[PDB]
User: What shape does this take?
Amino acid sequence: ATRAIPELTKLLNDEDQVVVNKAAVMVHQLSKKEASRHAIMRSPQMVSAIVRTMQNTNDVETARCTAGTLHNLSHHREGLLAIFKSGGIPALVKMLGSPVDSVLFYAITTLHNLLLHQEGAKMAVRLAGGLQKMVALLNKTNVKFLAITTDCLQILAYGNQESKLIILASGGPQALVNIMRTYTYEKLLWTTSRVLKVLSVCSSNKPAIVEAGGMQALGLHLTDPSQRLVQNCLWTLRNLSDAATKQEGMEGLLGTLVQLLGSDDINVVTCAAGILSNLTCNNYKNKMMVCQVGGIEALVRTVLRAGDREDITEPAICALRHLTSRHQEAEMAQNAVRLHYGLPVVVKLLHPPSHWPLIKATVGLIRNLALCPANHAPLREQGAIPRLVQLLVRAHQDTQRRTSFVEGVRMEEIVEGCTGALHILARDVHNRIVIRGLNTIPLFVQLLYSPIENIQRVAAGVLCELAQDKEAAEAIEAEGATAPLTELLHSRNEGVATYAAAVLFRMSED
Amino acid sequence: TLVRPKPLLLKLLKSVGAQKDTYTMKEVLFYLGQYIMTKRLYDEKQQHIVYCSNDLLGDLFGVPSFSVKEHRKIYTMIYRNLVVV
Amino acid sequence: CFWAAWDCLYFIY
Ligand SMILES: *CC(=O)Nc1ccc(NC(=O)C*)cc1
Assistant: This one.
C-alpha cells in the first residue's frame, strides 16, 4: 500500500523547523521495517524532501534521522537509484564536513554502498566534492570508520589518474602513512596498503610517499600473519623503491627483506630482491647494512635455489654487483661470494637458456667479482674466459649488421661489458695465455675504431693488460694498433689519453 | 688505500726524504720513481729498462734488471715489502 | 720518455 506518502511529503517541507524534527523522528522509525521501507523507496517525492532536509537543517536529531533513513535504504536495491536520481550524492558528501560522528557512519556508509552496488556514483562523487572531504576526514580517532573511508578512496582512485592526482594535492600520501604507522587493525591496514599501491604506479606520487616516510612504515607490517597484507606492502615498495635511494631509517627494513629471501613464496622473493636491487644502486651505507645482516649468504643461496628463473636471478645479480662495487665493504663482498659457493652458478648464467637482459647484468658482475684477486683462478676454472669471448663474438657479429632493442639490450653494451670484464681478468698471467690463445687480439683492434668512448676505454685498456708479455706485445704491434692508437692520445676523456698510450709504451720501443 | 711499508723498503723512501710512516700507493709509486730518476737507473739509450744490480732495488725486488711496464710484477714486487692497512 | 712512462704506470694503480 501507498496512500500516505503525500501526507508524509509536505510535512518535512514545513517552514516550522520544530515540526520537521517531530516529522522525521518517525520516518527513520518507520523505515526500519522491510514493509514500510518499500513505500519510501517507491516515492521519489518523499526522498526528494529527505535530501533537502539533510543539506538544509540546523538540528542534530533531524540530520541523524534523515541520513539514518538513507542508510536503511542502501541495503535494498531500488532504494539506491532513488537516492541517485534525487541528487543525493552532492548532499551526502556535504555531510562529510559537518562535524558529528552519528551522521558519518550513516553518510560514509551510504556513499560506500553507492560506490559499489550502483554505477555512475564513481563519477558523480569525483565531480561533486568527494575525495576532498574523504581525505580530510582521515584523522578521526575511530578505526572501523577509516576502513570504510580508505576503501572509498581505493574505488575512486582505481585506474583513474584524475583521482590519483586529486588525492595527491590534498596532502594524501603524508596522511596515509600515519595510518599504517599507527593503527593495528588488519582490515584498515590491508585497505590503506591497497590504496598506496594504486598511488605508487603513477610516477607523480612516487616520491611524495617516500618523502613522508612510506618505506620505513610499510616495513613494520612485513611480519604480520595475513599474507593478503604482506604481499601488498612488498608490491608497493617494489614499484615505490625507484625514488627511495636517498634517505635513512631503513635500518630494520633491510634486516627483514634478507630473511624473506628464505621464504617458500616465490612471489615474495621476486618482490624482495627487486627491492634490494633498487635500494642499493647509489647509497653508500645501504650496502654496508646488507653486508652486515648476512646479505651475501642469504642472497647467494637465492640464485642457487631459483634456477634458470631469470626473474629471480636478474635482481639478485644486480644486488650482488652493487654490494661488491664502490664502498668500504668491497673486499669482503667480493670474497663472501666465493666462500658461500656462489662463483660456479654465476658462470652458468652466462650460458643459455638465459636471456640477454640477465646476461648483461651478469657479465657486469664478473668485472666486480674479479677485483679481489682470490677470484681470478676459480673464474678461469669455471670456463669464464671462453664463454665471455663467445658472448663478445656474437655481440660484435650482430652490431656489425650495419649493412642494413625489443629484447631490451643495446648490443653495444655487451661489448662494453665483456671487454670491460676481460680487462680485469687479464691481470692473472694464466688468463693472459687463455685470452691470447683464444685468438682475440685481432678482434680488439677492430673494436678500437668504435666511436663509443666506453669501448675505447676498455679495448685500449685490456690490450694494456696484455702488453706485459712480449709474446703478445710485438704480436699486437703487427695486427694494426700502430696507427689507430696513434691519435687516440688526444681524445677528450683522460681515461683514453692514457691506456691507449700505455700500450704504445712497450711495443715498438727497443 | 693505505699501506705501511716494511722498514727495509722505508730506507728507499727515507733516502729521497720521506717523512711519514704510512703512504698511499700513489706516494710510494712517486717516491720510488724519484729515486730511479735521481740515482739514474734507467738506460738513457732506450729508457724503458731499469737497472739495479748492486742497488737497494736489487735487494728489495730481487731481479737485477726489470722493465718499466711489466705492471703486475712491479705491482707485486712492491706488494711483498708492505703490510696493508 | 721515462717521465712519460711512470705516469702511465701509476694509472692502473
Ligand atoms: C702512457 C704512455 O705510455 N705514454 C708514453 C710513453 C712513451 C712515449 N715514448 C717516447 O716518447 C720515447 C710516449 C708516450
Summary: The interface with chain A takes residues 46, 48-49, 67-73 of chain B (CB under 8 Å). The longest helix of chain B spans residues 25-38. Residues 57 and 64 of chain B are 8 Å apart (CA to CA).
